[PDB]
Amino acid sequence: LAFFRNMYDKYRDAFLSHLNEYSLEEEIKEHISKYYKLLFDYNCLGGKNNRGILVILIYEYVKNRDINSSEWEKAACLAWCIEILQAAFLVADDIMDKGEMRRNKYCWYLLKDVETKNAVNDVLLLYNSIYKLIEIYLRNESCYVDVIATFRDATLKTIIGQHLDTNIFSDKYSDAHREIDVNNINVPQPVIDINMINFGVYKNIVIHKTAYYSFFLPIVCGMLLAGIDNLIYKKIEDISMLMGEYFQIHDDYLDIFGDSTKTGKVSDIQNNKLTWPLIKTFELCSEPDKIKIVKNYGKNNLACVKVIDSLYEQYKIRKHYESYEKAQKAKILSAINELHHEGIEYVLKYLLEILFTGV
Amino acid sequence: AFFRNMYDKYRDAFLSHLNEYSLEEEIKEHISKYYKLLFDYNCLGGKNNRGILVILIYEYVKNRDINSSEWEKAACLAWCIEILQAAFLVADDIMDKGEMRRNKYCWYLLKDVETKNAVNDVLLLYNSIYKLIEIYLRNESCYVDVIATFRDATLKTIIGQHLDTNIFSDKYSDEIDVNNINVPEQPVIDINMINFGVYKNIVIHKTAYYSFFLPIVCGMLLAGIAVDNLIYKKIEDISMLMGEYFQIHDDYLDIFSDIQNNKLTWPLIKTFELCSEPDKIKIVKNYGKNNLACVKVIDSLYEQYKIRKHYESYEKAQKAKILSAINELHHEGIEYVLKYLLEILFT
Ligand SMILES: CC(C)=CCC/C(C)=C/CC/C(C)=C/CCC(C)=CCOP(=O)(O)OP(=O)(O)O
Ligand SMILES: CC(C)=CCCC(C)=CCC/C(C)=C/CC/C(C)=C/COP(=O)(O)OP(=O)(O)O
């Protein structure tokens, strides 16, 4: 954990050293290293590092065995690669959702020395840096191809979850009969589609957007590098899905019922997002309140968000979350005990306890 | 060249992969509708020089019989570079706030798309390449080397793109202010960066590697020419010369949005080396401005210093320099392709 955090610079400078080998004039090289050192530092440092720590712990507990410094160097590489992946996702998400704060600092894209134009380019650099690092440190491992495929496949699932989260209430999803007009370049007003306000659709989004890169990818990383393919991978796939759902519902809860100075970020109601509080309120509310939701949800105006916010207090959404949290935490524990692997079971139970705080 | 008929197979091969995801049937139909248009709109319509370059290099190295299955792997790599070009095109238009590309509206401008989807779509298109390389080349021995060639060429392009975006920025003039989100920096020219050395650094990284090196290395790797072969460095040097040649022509075409977008172009560097001191101040005062009078002034200086004639002089001198480097290859098959590519480049 403290070891993992200390290995950071080794991986950052290994990648910066690779760019430094490029055939460029010495002055250009120094500007590049100044820019990219800050890109990594600013966006890779500051989170709970749950995904990174999950690799390290799964690598150690897959089997009780001797692990040399060189083997740990490969494990802390994969651990930092998932943090770089989280860093790329967060920069991209903030551009896309027009974010203000992340990890108690300004969104990288808002910086006037950066802007959207560099941030778009920087998402791809951070994303490609992962595969450069896995090559530098795992080039000769037999799990190499399987590890790169795991990153590639989790990323693809996240891109699809991101697409669904962005477009679930869009005109092209509500008007399936009409093709996308490639001649219309006017601005779209976003409104909810009640046919999509259901937990079935929610799970489809949340599993793809969070479960695969936050839980499946780090666990499979630790296991592939340890040397294990086996029927346990499907069992860990199912647990990852349940943990992803659990993690995202809490993230939704935090968005409306959390302090920005504690979470590090200020938007779901204004951004017209399909959230768990929205689905819960909709199943529990009266017909006039349903129409009141449709009229005020997805609007940048503070008086419209207050209407939604007041309705969340009215239908005591915080208490329903508390009841969901206990029902799901218990459900995941049950699935973990059906694993029949004491090592992984220990890590997953520990991860489940430390999820919302980190460490 | 049956490469155009193979498009749908690679498109559907990737779409079929997404279709295997655990999603409700209605969600699957919306996804396939969206992503079929994303591929079609951005992968079809270009000259396909990069795609064709793979096919031609593959054919003229393997001077022997090539079966349908071997061509299926070659046209996969060829379409992968076209998907890469598609991902670059979409990203570039978001970044440069483009209006038109290949005689149609930029994908990000579309009402049903917007910048938010366009950012996400660049990464889908980009990752679809590696899914396709896996589907069709996972059992080839060149597999790892091919993926490494795509990764390394992309990394170089990202760096050239960074340089092209920031070469005149206040951060490149002499630390980045992580507290400034409110004071927008006005775009301005930096005369210390108006030189051919800096320009070659940008152009080689931004174009040469993915436009020439990557497609040639793809054909060669798939044909079976070993990575340890000294010819790869020779092809690297030719790719750099061809990249420079291709980009200078692209800059020439733009004028005869770069002026308004404050870009370091070959006509700007040429005009600056050839013009008087009052005209240098006139360039600094009018370049990089979204005002019609300002662009008109820069346009007139390019006409005055007959930049079109200097390009014509450059194009003849550079063409010879590459032909000379191509003849030092000692490979009749590749040499024919490179000479043919050089003739057909602009059309
Ligand atoms: C890594 C990714 C996908 C990206 C983000 C940012 C980067 C590095 C971007 C793109 C910069 C780039 C290489 C740009 C644009 C050049 C372009 C689209 C084209 C012109 O090529 P032609 O061959 O003349 O056009 P056709 O394809 O239409 O024939
Ligand atoms: C392929 C790439 C890089 C991207 C483009 C677009 C995609 C797929 C998206 C990103 C959307 C996404 C999954 C989001 C962000 C989630 C996020 C930053 C959040 C919260 O996780 P925590 O674990 O709470 O944060 P810490 O890492 O700070 O602990």
XYZ file of N, CA, C and O in Angstrom, chain A residues 72-205:
536
model
N 7.402 -8.255 -7.844
C 6.616 -7.173 -7.262
C 6.631 -5.951 -8.151
O 5.643 -5.224 -8.203
N 7.754 -5.728 -8.846
C 7.971 -4.651 -9.804
C 6.963 -4.789 -10.988
O 6.452 -3.782 -11.482
N 6.672 -6.033 -11.404
C 5.719 -6.349 -12.457
C 4.276 -6.159 -11.943
O 3.434 -5.617 -12.661
N 4.009 -6.558 -10.695
C 2.694 -6.397 -10.069
C 2.322 -4.911 -9.820
O 1.184 -4.533 -10.068
N 3.282 -4.082 -9.360
C 3.077 -2.656 -9.074
C 3.014 -1.853 -10.380
O 2.589 -0.694 -10.371
N 3.474 -2.463 -11.492
C 3.377 -1.883 -12.820
C 1.901 -1.975 -13.223
O 1.313 -0.950 -13.518
N 1.306 -3.191 -13.178
C -0.094 -3.446 -13.525
C -1.035 -2.659 -12.635
O -2.067 -2.180 -13.112
N -0.661 -2.506 -11.351
C -1.417 -1.747 -10.369
C -1.444 -0.270 -10.762
O -2.514 0.333 -10.753
N -0.297 0.289 -11.154
C -0.231 1.691 -11.590
C -0.879 1.916 -12.956
O -1.478 2.968 -13.161
N -0.841 0.913 -13.833
C -1.473 0.951 -15.138
C -3.013 1.121 -14.998
O -3.606 1.853 -15.780
N -3.636 0.492 -13.965
C -5.074 0.627 -13.727
C -5.379 2.028 -13.157
O -6.478 2.551 -13.407
N -4.385 2.654 -12.459
C -4.528 4.002 -11.914
C -4.367 5.022 -13.016
O -5.046 6.048 -13.006
N -3.510 4.720 -14.003
C -3.327 5.560 -15.182
C -4.619 5.465 -16.018
O -5.079 6.470 -16.558
N -5.223 4.273 -16.070
C -6.473 4.038 -16.791
C -7.585 4.845 -16.153
O -8.320 5.530 -16.871
N -7.660 4.819 -14.812
C -8.612 5.618 -14.047
C -8.357 7.126 -14.327
O -9.317 7.877 -14.564
N -7.072 7.539 -14.353
C -6.668 8.908 -14.671
C -7.180 9.322 -16.061
O -7.720 10.425 -16.195
N -7.091 8.406 -17.076
C -7.535 8.743 -18.446
C -9.038 8.865 -18.494
O -9.538 9.832 -19.052
N -9.747 7.929 -17.839
C -11.192 7.921 -17.711
C -11.701 9.180 -17.033
O -12.688 9.748 -17.488
N -11.018 9.629 -15.975
C -11.496 10.784 -15.239
C -11.342 12.055 -16.020
O -12.269 12.866 -15.991
N -10.245 12.201 -16.789
C -10.011 13.375 -17.629
C -11.066 13.424 -18.734
O -11.651 14.472 -18.973
N -11.343 12.278 -19.357
C -12.288 12.143 -20.446
C -13.679 12.431 -19.959
O -14.391 13.204 -20.603
N -14.065 11.826 -18.806
C -15.381 11.989 -18.213
C -15.683 13.446 -17.897
O -16.815 13.886 -18.092
N -14.678 14.173 -17.404
C -14.839 15.558 -17.023
C -15.013 16.442 -18.252
O -15.800 17.372 -18.193
N -14.354 16.116 -19.378
C -14.511 16.840 -20.654
C -15.963 16.624 -21.096
O -16.685 17.576 -21.367
N -16.365 15.350 -21.160
C -17.661 14.895 -21.611
C -18.811 15.478 -20.790
O -19.762 16.025 -21.370
N -18.735 15.359 -19.462
C -19.772 15.867 -18.563
C -19.586 17.330 -18.193
O -20.333 17.832 -17.377
N -18.609 18.014 -18.765
C -18.322 19.412 -18.458
C -18.190 19.620 -16.938
O -18.881 20.458 -16.341
N -17.296 18.827 -16.343
C -16.974 18.848 -14.921
C -16.295 20.119 -14.459
O -15.783 20.887 -15.279
N -16.294 20.351 -13.138
C -15.714 21.539 -12.525
C -14.536 21.160 -11.612
O -13.446 21.742 -11.698
N -14.766 20.182 -10.736
C -13.749 19.736 -9.794
C -13.625 18.230 -9.813
O -14.597 17.529 -10.072
N -12.422 17.733 -9.510
C -12.167 16.301 -9.363
C -10.978 16.166 -8.443
O -9.942 16.809 -8.655
N -11.153 15.367 -7.377
C -10.122 15.109 -6.336
C -9.669 16.422 -5.657
O -8.476 16.631 -5.386
N -10.662 17.321 -5.428
C -10.571 18.628 -4.754
C -9.739 19.663 -5.489
O -9.352 20.692 -4.906
N -9.512 19.428 -6.786
C -8.807 20.379 -7.637
C -9.565 20.552 -8.923
O -10.500 19.796 -9.198
N -9.207 21.588 -9.682
C -9.810 21.889 -10.965
C -9.597 20.725 -11.942
O -8.540 20.085 -11.945
N -10.604 20.479 -12.782
C -10.561 19.499 -13.847
C -9.473 19.960 -14.831
O -9.436 21.134 -15.229
N -8.553 19.027 -15.162
C -7.419 19.227 -16.058
C -7.815 20.017 -17.318
O -7.126 20.958 -17.688
N -8.947 19.683 -17.934
C -9.387 20.353 -19.166
C -9.718 21.837 -18.965
O -9.595 22.603 -19.921
N -10.131 22.248 -17.727
C -10.475 23.657 -17.419
C -9.275 24.587 -17.387
O -9.426 25.794 -17.616
N -8.099 24.046 -17.084
C -6.836 24.785 -17.021
C -6.603 25.513 -18.354
O -6.744 24.911 -19.417
N -6.321 26.813 -18.320
C -6.139 27.569 -19.565
C -4.865 27.174 -20.333
O -4.823 27.369 -21.543
N -3.855 26.601 -19.669
C -2.661 26.093 -20.376
C -2.947 24.734 -21.075
O -2.138 24.277 -21.861
N -4.076 24.097 -20.749
C -4.460 22.776 -21.217
C -5.602 22.904 -22.218
O -5.380 22.751 -23.422
N -6.825 23.204 -21.723
C -8.054 23.334 -22.535
C -8.494 21.958 -23.022
O -7.730 20.991 -22.931
N -9.728 21.859 -23.523
C -10.302 20.628 -24.069
C -9.381 19.977 -25.130
O -9.138 18.771 -25.044
N -8.852 20.783 -26.085
C -7.990 20.321 -27.174
C -6.817 19.477 -26.661
O -6.633 18.371 -27.165
N -6.075 19.939 -25.617
C -4.987 19.131 -25.092
C -5.493 17.979 -24.289
O -4.903 16.906 -24.363
N -6.592 18.167 -23.553
C -7.114 17.121 -22.684
C -7.534 15.885 -23.473
O -7.298 14.762 -23.003
N -8.129 16.096 -24.677
C -8.567 15.025 -25.582
C -7.332 14.234 -25.981
O -7.321 12.993 -25.869
N -6.281 14.954 -26.388
C -5.011 14.350 -26.790
C -4.342 13.615 -25.621
O -3.832 12.520 -25.812
N -4.388 14.211 -24.396
C -3.840 13.670 -23.137
C -4.551 12.368 -22.656
O -3.896 11.526 -22.044
N -5.866 12.193 -22.937
C -6.600 10.967 -22.585
C -5.937 9.803 -23.340
O -5.692 8.735 -22.766
N -5.635 10.036 -24.621
C -5.047 9.031 -25.481
C -3.616 8.762 -25.146
O -3.240 7.594 -25.187
N -2.858 9.780 -24.699
C -1.500 9.551 -24.263
C -1.512 8.686 -23.021
O -0.803 7.675 -22.983
N -2.310 9.072 -22.006
C -2.391 8.311 -20.761
C -2.819 6.897 -21.069
O -2.209 5.962 -20.583
N -3.808 6.738 -21.941
C -4.300 5.426 -22.318
C -3.216 4.568 -23.004
O -3.066 3.390 -22.676
N -2.458 5.152 -23.918
C -1.423 4.400 -24.614
C -0.190 4.145 -23.747
O 0.507 3.159 -23.980
N 0.042 4.980 -22.721
C 1.164 4.820 -21.800
C 1.090 3.499 -21.049
O 2.136 2.925 -20.728
N -0.137 3.016 -20.795
C -0.418 1.749 -20.108
C 0.266 0.598 -20.845
O 0.977 -0.184 -20.239
N 0.042 0.493 -22.149
C 0.556 -0.595 -22.964
C 2.056 -0.482 -23.164
O 2.717 -1.523 -23.287
N 2.601 0.746 -23.137
C 4.043 0.943 -23.202
C 4.668 0.381 -21.908
O 5.656 -0.347 -21.990
N 4.058 0.662 -20.748
C 4.523 0.202 -19.443
C 4.441 -1.297 -19.295
O 5.394 -1.883 -18.824
N 3.318 -1.923 -19.673
C 3.134 -3.372 -19.644
C 4.200 -4.026 -20.544
O 4.750 -5.048 -20.146
N 4.539 -3.407 -21.712
C 5.583 -3.912 -22.601
C 6.951 -3.825 -21.913
O 7.647 -4.827 -21.869
N 7.329 -2.648 -21.373
C 8.610 -2.421 -20.688
C 8.863 -3.467 -19.575
O 9.953 -4.016 -19.514
N 7.847 -3.758 -18.742
C 7.963 -4.617 -17.563
C 7.434 -6.053 -17.692
O 7.800 -6.869 -16.840
N 6.568 -6.368 -18.684
C 6.015 -7.720 -18.815
C 6.166 -8.330 -20.226
O 5.619 -9.396 -20.492
N 6.963 -7.688 -21.083
C 7.334 -8.086 -22.464
C 7.577 -9.617 -22.609
O 7.145 -10.244 -23.588
N 8.304 -10.190 -21.632
C 8.779 -11.572 -21.675
C 7.993 -12.553 -20.792
O 8.297 -13.757 -20.799
N 6.950 -12.062 -20.084
C 6.082 -12.916 -19.275
C 5.185 -13.685 -20.214
O 4.906 -13.196 -21.303
N 4.752 -14.893 -19.833
C 3.880 -15.675 -20.700
C 2.441 -15.123 -20.667
O 1.722 -15.237 -21.673
N 2.042 -14.487 -19.528
C 0.703 -13.902 -19.348
C 0.533 -12.578 -20.135
O -0.592 -12.078 -20.218
N 1.638 -12.020 -20.683
C 1.712 -10.758 -21.415
C 0.511 -10.454 -22.339
O -0.160 -9.451 -22.141
N 0.255 -11.300 -23.325
C -0.809 -11.140 -24.307
C -2.198 -11.150 -23.624
O -3.058 -10.332 -23.977
N -2.385 -12.032 -22.627
C -3.623 -12.151 -21.875
C -3.895 -10.910 -21.026
O -5.059 -10.510 -20.887
N -2.829 -10.322 -20.452
C -2.913 -9.097 -19.636
C -3.336 -7.908 -20.535
O -4.297 -7.216 -20.196
N -2.664 -7.732 -21.706
C -2.992 -6.641 -22.613
C -4.434 -6.800 -23.134
O -5.164 -5.802 -23.157
N -4.871 -8.049 -23.399
C -6.226 -8.346 -23.851
C -7.263 -8.014 -22.769
O -8.349 -7.548 -23.099
N -6.910 -8.214 -21.484
C -7.773 -7.919 -20.330
C -7.981 -6.393 -20.220
O -9.103 -5.946 -19.950
N -6.911 -5.604 -20.452
C -7.010 -4.142 -20.441
C -7.872 -3.655 -21.594
O -8.759 -2.844 -21.388
N -7.641 -4.201 -22.777
C -8.317 -3.851 -24.007
C -9.833 -4.120 -23.885
O -10.625 -3.215 -24.155
N -10.215 -5.346 -23.419
C -11.590 -5.809 -23.254
C -12.349 -5.079 -22.154
O -13.537 -4.805 -22.353
N -11.710 -4.748 -21.026
C -12.353 -3.979 -19.947
C -12.609 -2.571 -20.444
O -13.678 -2.014 -20.168
N -11.620 -1.992 -21.189
C -11.749 -0.657 -21.749
C -12.947 -0.614 -22.686
O -13.750 0.288 -22.537
N -13.081 -1.585 -23.606
C -14.191 -1.680 -24.551
C -15.528 -1.725 -23.844
O -16.439 -1.000 -24.248
N -15.633 -2.502 -22.756
C -16.862 -2.577 -21.964
C -17.187 -1.230 -21.295
O -18.342 -0.810 -21.335
N -16.167 -0.516 -20.784
C -16.301 0.813 -20.163
C -16.781 1.848 -21.181
O -17.724 2.583 -20.872
N -16.209 1.841 -22.410
C -16.589 2.736 -23.516
C -18.090 2.567 -23.821
O -18.817 3.562 -23.920
N -18.554 1.322 -23.873
C -19.961 0.957 -24.111
C -20.886 1.399 -22.930
O -21.950 1.953 -23.196
N -20.439 1.232 -21.676
C -21.181 1.690 -20.507
C -21.282 3.208 -20.475
O -22.330 3.781 -20.131
N -20.198 3.865 -20.907
C -20.102 5.314 -21.010
C -21.073 5.849 -22.097
O -21.808 6.805 -21.850
N -21.117 5.177 -23.237
C -22.014 5.474 -24.340
C -23.471 5.395 -23.869
O -24.261 6.310 -24.131
N -23.820 4.312 -23.154
C -25.180 4.113 -22.651
C -25.559 5.162 -21.645
O -26.637 5.718 -21.743
N -24.655 5.481 -20.711
C -24.858 6.499 -19.676
C -25.063 7.889 -20.292
O -25.787 8.685 -19.743
N -24.425 8.159 -21.442
C -24.507 9.430 -22.152
C -25.795 9.540 -22.997
O -26.372 10.621 -23.100
N -26.239 8.428 -23.589
C -27.314 8.413 -24.569
C -28.621 7.701 -24.206
O -29.527 7.696 -25.050
N -28.743 7.112 -22.996
C -29.945 6.365 -22.590
C -31.264 7.177 -22.728
O -32.284 6.599 -23.100
N -31.225 8.497 -22.495
C -32.405 9.381 -22.613
C -32.368 10.242 -23.893
O -33.138 11.190 -24.015
N -31.453 9.952 -24.825
C -31.300 10.754 -26.041
C -32.365 10.438 -27.057
O -32.931 9.333 -27.052
N -32.603 11.419 -27.957
C -33.550 11.331 -29.058
C -33.349 10.070 -29.866
O -34.343 9.469 -30.228
N -32.100 9.675 -30.180
C -31.871 8.479 -31.011
C -32.242 7.159 -30.321
O -32.426 6.149 -31.017
N -32.358 7.169 -28.981
C -32.729 5.991 -28.206
C -34.257 5.983 -28.031
O -34.855 4.909 -28.061
N -34.887 7.183 -27.914
C -36.358 7.367 -27.801
C -37.073 7.280 -29.183
O -38.272 7.031 -29.211
N -36.352 7.584 -30.299
C -36.822 7.553 -31.688
C -35.977 6.545 -32.498
O -35.286 6.926 -33.448
N -36.051 5.260 -32.131
C -35.310 4.170 -32.778
C -35.658 4.007 -34.270
O -34.815 3.578 -35.060
N -36.904 4.355 -34.637
C -37.464 4.327 -35.992
C -36.793 5.354 -36.931
O -36.740 5.139 -38.139
N -36.339 6.484 -36.382
C -35.684 7.499 -37.182
C -34.171 7.328 -37.129
O -33.611 7.142 -36.037
N -33.514 7.378 -38.305
C -32.043 7.311 -38.406
C -31.454 8.641 -37.884
O -32.148 9.673 -37.883
N -30.152 8.630 -37.498
C -29.407 9.824 -37.071
C -29.291 10.742 -38.329
O -28.871 10.262 -39.389
N -29.761 12.001 -38.242
C -29.690 12.947 -39.367
C -28.266 13.515 -39.461
O -27.868 14.346 -38.628
N -27.499 13.055 -40.457
C -26.102 13.494 -40.657
C -26.021 14.902 -41.293
O -24.918 15.384 -41.615
N -27.179 15.554 -41.461
C -27.270 16.906 -42.027
C -27.744 17.927 -40.978
O -27.759 19.128 -41.238
N -28.090 17.436 -39.777
C -28.497 18.286 -38.678
C -27.343 18.528 -37.717
O -26.970 17.658 -36.941
N -26.874 19.779 -37.706
C -25.793 20.284 -36.867
C -26.298 21.368 -35.908
O -25.498 22.095 -35.326
N -27.618 21.434 -35.682
C -28.177 22.356 -34.679
C -27.886 21.747 -33.288
O -27.487 20.570 -33.188
N -28.073 22.552 -32.217
C -27.950 22.076 -30.831
C -29.184 21.170 -30.571
O -30.246 21.476 -31.117
N -29.087 20.051 -29.791
C -30.287 19.192 -29.562
C -31.442 19.922 -28.878
O -31.168 20.928 -28.241
N -33.333 20.269 -26.237
C -33.392 20.158 -24.767
C -33.523 18.681 -24.294
O -34.458 17.991 -24.714
N -32.585 18.189 -23.440
C -32.652 16.788 -22.988
C -33.782 16.554 -22.004
O -34.023 17.377 -21.127
N -34.497 15.443 -22.171
C -35.594 15.035 -21.281
C -35.553 13.528 -21.040
O -35.154 12.771 -21.928
N -36.011 13.102 -19.850
C -36.070 11.688 -19.441
C -37.072 10.878 -20.298
O -38.023 11.434 -20.815
N -36.808 9.580 -20.471
C -37.640 8.599 -21.165
C -37.983 7.565 -20.099
O -37.137 6.748 -19.742
N -39.227 7.596 -19.614
C -39.766 6.771 -18.517
C -39.639 5.260 -18.795
O -39.530 4.475 -17.854
N -39.575 4.870 -20.074
C -39.373 3.477 -20.505
C -37.961 2.956 -20.148
O -37.728 1.744 -20.106
N -37.027 3.881 -19.895
C -35.646 3.591 -19.518
C -35.444 3.729 -18.021
O -34.434 3.272 -17.502
N -36.396 4.347 -17.312
C -36.257 4.470 -15.861
C -36.657 3.134 -15.231
O -37.808 2.963 -14.854
N -35.705 2.168 -15.200
C -35.827 0.831 -14.606
C -34.443 0.283 -14.232
O -33.448 0.613 -14.884
N -34.387 -0.550 -13.177
C -33.153 -1.132 -12.629
C -32.438 -2.113 -13.597
O -31.218 -2.268 -13.504
N -33.200 -2.711 -14.521
C -32.696 -3.634 -15.539
C -31.721 -2.954 -16.490
O -30.608 -3.440 -16.707
N -32.115 -1.780 -16.999
C -31.333 -0.889 -17.862
C -30.137 -0.323 -17.050
O -29.012 -0.363 -17.531
N -30.384 0.119 -15.805
C -29.394 0.678 -14.881
C -28.213 -0.241 -14.702
O -27.070 0.208 -14.818
N -28.498 -1.518 -14.406
C -27.496 -2.564 -14.201
C -26.675 -2.771 -15.469
O -25.462 -2.877 -15.370
N -27.319 -2.800 -16.653
C -26.650 -2.919 -17.945
C -25.568 -1.818 -18.090
O -24.411 -2.114 -18.394
N -25.943 -0.554 -17.775
C -25.074 0.622 -17.849
C -23.900 0.495 -16.848
O -22.744 0.514 -17.249
